């Protein structure tokens, strides 16, 4: 069935593709940012996670709707793991020059995200009407993980998140995570793990990880094949079906907006599921791209099997299920369900339409 699949694929290929002046609003306006937050007292070591790193697109059909991530150091940090959550956590600190920089914002030992996340509103806000470039408006509606939330002329929409770096160890509760070593080697898996690590806030004062950036490297050497897709003659379908998923979500997301069940399902829990079963079939071989139909229905009938048995374990914290009957209710996991096995059944219909 890859003809359909394909011709879904190539539709959003070229639209990605596709000139662009978007790209370039955006990055105007997140320098102005960086420079204005950095010469201020809290945010003088803010950053960009990466560089080049103005156009990075969560909703794969939107391509209007940008998310950028800024970062700040945090040296010697105190990490709390809240009520045996495995995944939230409370900020503390070691205090060698005990006035850090973000002093300002401690409670007692325990740092406060949303103090941050004002006078980090409060400041990009303050320089967002000096702007005299283009039109920039924010909206603070609630749900501060897509903290801030630009607007830049009609179309083009910027989430702006900010994230803590350490450089210490993984928490200990990513100790069994990242089982990658029968796919990608355990010698990979090493390297992963002497990268930083990032925390965001939830929505209390907890904090939880942030693992975009290792998606990111897996993403981009993602065989068990040092020369996977380098070539055509080993041309894998993995990415494909990532996009496949993601946009079947989206889609779905979109057709319900209305009714509200689907409203805690994100591309995370897609990307999860995906790199589970990439863990499931690690050879190249079993992702060949003259299967890419095949494939595809692996992912989605594991995507179903986790949601049937309320089950999708973190790919970096295996104890912390991701469809828990307390993080997502069962009305809603069944009712994803029936939505997805119709379109598996009828050949995906929410596809040929855009
Ligand atoms: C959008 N959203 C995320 C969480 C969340 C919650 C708890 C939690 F521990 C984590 C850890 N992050 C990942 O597992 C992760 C996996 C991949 Br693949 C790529 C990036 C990632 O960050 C995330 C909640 N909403
Ligand atoms: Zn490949």
Redesign the pocket.
């Known amino acids: 069935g890859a003809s359909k699949l394909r011709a879904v694929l190539e539709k959003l290929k070229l639209s990605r593709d596709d000139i662009s002046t978007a790209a370039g609003m955006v990055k105007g306006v997140v320098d102005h940012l960086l420079l204005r937050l950095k010469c201020d007292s809290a945010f003088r070591g803010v950053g960009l996670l990466n560089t080049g790193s103005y156009y990075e697109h969560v909703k794969i059909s939107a391509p209007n709707e940008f998310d950028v991530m800024f970062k700040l150091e945090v040296p010697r940090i105190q990490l709390e793991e809240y009520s045996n959550t ?3 956590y409370f900020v503390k600190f070691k205090r060698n020059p005990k006035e850090n920089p973000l002093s300002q914002f401690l409670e007692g030992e325990i740092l406060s995200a949303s103090k941050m996340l004002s006078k980090f509103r409060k400041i990009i806000k303050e320089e967002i009407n000096d702007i005299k470039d283009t039109d920039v408006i924010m909206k603070r509606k609630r749900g501060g ?1 897509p903290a801030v939330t630009l607007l830049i002329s009609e179309k083009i929409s910027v989430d702006i998140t900010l994230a803590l770096e350490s450089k210490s160890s993984w928490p200990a ?1 990513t100790q069994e ?1 990242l089982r990658i070593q029968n796919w990608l080697s355990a010698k990979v898996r090493k390297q992963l793990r002497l990268k930083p690590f ?1 925390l ?1 806030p ?1 929505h209390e004062e907890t904090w ?8 990111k490297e ?1 993403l981009n050497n993602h065989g068990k094949s040092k020369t996977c897709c380098e070539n055509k003659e080993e041309k894998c379908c993995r990415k494909d079906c990532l996009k496949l998923m993601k946009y079947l979500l989206e889609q779905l997301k979109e057709r319900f907006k209305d009714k509200k069940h689907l409203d805690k399902f ?4 897609v ?2 599921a ?2 589970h079963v990439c863990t499931q079939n690690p050879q190249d071989s079993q992702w060949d791209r003259k299967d890419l139909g095949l494939c595809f229905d692996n992912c989605v009938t594991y995507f179903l099997q986790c949601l049937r048995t309320e089950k999708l374990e ?4 295996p104890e ?1 299920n ?1 469809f828990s009957s307390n993080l997502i209710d069962k009305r809603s996991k069944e009712f994803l369900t029936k939505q997805i096995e119709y379109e598996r059944n009828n050949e995906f219909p929410v596809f040929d339409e855009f």
């Open positions: 495995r995944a939230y993980s509760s995570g990032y965001v939830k939880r990880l942030s693992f975009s950036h290792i998606e897996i994100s591309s995370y829990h990307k999860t995906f790199f973190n790919y970096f914290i912390f991701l």
